[PDB]
């Protein structure tokens, strides 16, 4: 028995094992576009993914993660509200059982079909493990997905999902370019928050892009064929692996655009 997204172990139950779930800077949150403050001092984001080296894709029972080689500054995020260099370690998604839900963050209460999270850690801390224990340890880039036209750059990911259907399965996933998942504009909102899955540590500087990317119904449908369970167990479809919006509390959301 452990945390999950079911009726008996879902987000509403997480606080029992992870008290920080009721903390002061929990994520996700609803982004009120009219209350967000334009900050002229916010620098443009600098995304350098030209040398990215993907290694593997795996189903960890909560979602599927694409892992990268983070032993050198191959794929990094700089600028914006960040101080220093952050290395990309993995990316994963959050999606729903229907196109009307799936994203973790919401914009003026609007929910998207899914949300992509590109996780980076502050190189000043040496490794991911040390970084999650710091208030400025991680930088997660959040991108919304809406259903419409297909996204060619996402197809390589959808085609390998069959090989990692159940919890615990992993497969080689080399030469994947994450640049094909980015929208045209890099305008964003930013706030101090946390990881949206246990341990729910409050070590993240969220950077949520304003422009969503479009994916086809067929592409998101394949996400929904994954399983929460491991092989040889009752099939439980991996859907609605998202945490509901949390109280903003004493926090301000800043925007890089007016
Ligand atoms: Zn996530």
Curated annotation (Swiss-Prot):
Broad class of enzyme this protein falls into: lyase
Phenotype upon changing residue 60 to V: Reduced activity
EC code(s) of this entry: 4.2.1.1, 4.2.1.69
Result of changing residue 63 to S: 2-fold decrease in enzyme efficiency, as determined by kcat/KM ratio, and efficiently inhibited by chlorzolamide
Outcome of substituting residue 117 to E: Strongly reduced activity
Outcome following mutation: residue 140 to H: Impaired activity
Keyword set, alphabetical order: Acetylation, Cell membrane, Cytoplasm, Disease variant, Lyase, Membrane, Metal-binding, Osteopetrosis, Phosphoprotein, Zinc
Residue numbers annotated as active site: 62
Consequence when changing residue 62 to W: Impaired activity, rescued by 4-methylimidazole (4-MI). Impaired activity, not rescued by 4-methylimidazole (4-MI)
Impact noted for substituting residue 60 to H: Reduced proton transfer
Zinc as UniProt keyword: yes
Record flagged with keyword Amino-acid biosynthesis: no
Activity modulation comment: Activated by X-ray, histamine, L-adrenaline, L- and D-phenylalanine, L- and D-histidine, L-His-OMe and beta-Ala-His (carnosine).
Subunit architecture: Interacts with SLC4A4. Interaction with SLC4A7 regulates SLC4A7 transporter activity. Interacts with SLC26A6 isoform 4 (via C-terminus cytoplasmic domain).
UniProt miscellaneous comment: Target of drugs used in treatments against glaucoma disorder and breast cancer.
Family: Belongs to the alpha-carbonic anhydrase family.
Protein known as: Carbonic anhydrase 2
Originating species: Homo sapiens (Human)
């Amino acid at each position: 028995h452990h945390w999950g997204y079911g009726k008996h172990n879902g987000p509403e139950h997480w606080h029992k094992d992870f008290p920080i779930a009721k903390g002061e800077r929990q994520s996700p949150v609803d982004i009120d576009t009219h209350t967000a403050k334009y900050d002229p001092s916010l620098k443009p984001l600098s995304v350098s993914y030209d040398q990215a080296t993907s290694l593997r894709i795996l189903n960890n029972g909560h979602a599927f993660h694409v892992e990268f080689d983070d032993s050198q500054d191959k794929a990094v995020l700089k600028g914006g509200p960040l101080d220093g260099t952050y290395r990309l370690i993995q990316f994963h998604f959050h999606w729903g059982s229907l196109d009307g839900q799936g994203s973790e963050h919401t914009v003026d209460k609007k929910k998207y079909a899914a949300e992509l999270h590109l996780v980076h850690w502050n190189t000043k801390y040496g490794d991911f493990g040390k970084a999650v224990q710091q208030p400025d340890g991680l930088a997660v880039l959040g991108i919304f997905l809406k259903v419409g036209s297909a996204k060619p750059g996402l197809q390589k990911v959808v085609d390998v999902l069959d090989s990692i259907k159940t919890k615990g399965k992993s497969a080689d996933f080399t030469n994947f370019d994450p640049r094909g998942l980015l929208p045209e504009s890099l305008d964003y909102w930013t706030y101090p928050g946390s990881l949206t899955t246990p341990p729910l540590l409050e070590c993240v500087t969220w950077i949520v892009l304003k422009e969503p990317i479009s994916v086809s119904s067929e592409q998101v449908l394949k996400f929904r064929k994954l399983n929460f369970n491991g092989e040889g167990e009752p099939e439980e479809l991996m859907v609605d692996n998202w945490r509901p919006a949390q109280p903003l509390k004493n926090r301000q959301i800043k925007a890089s655009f007016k």
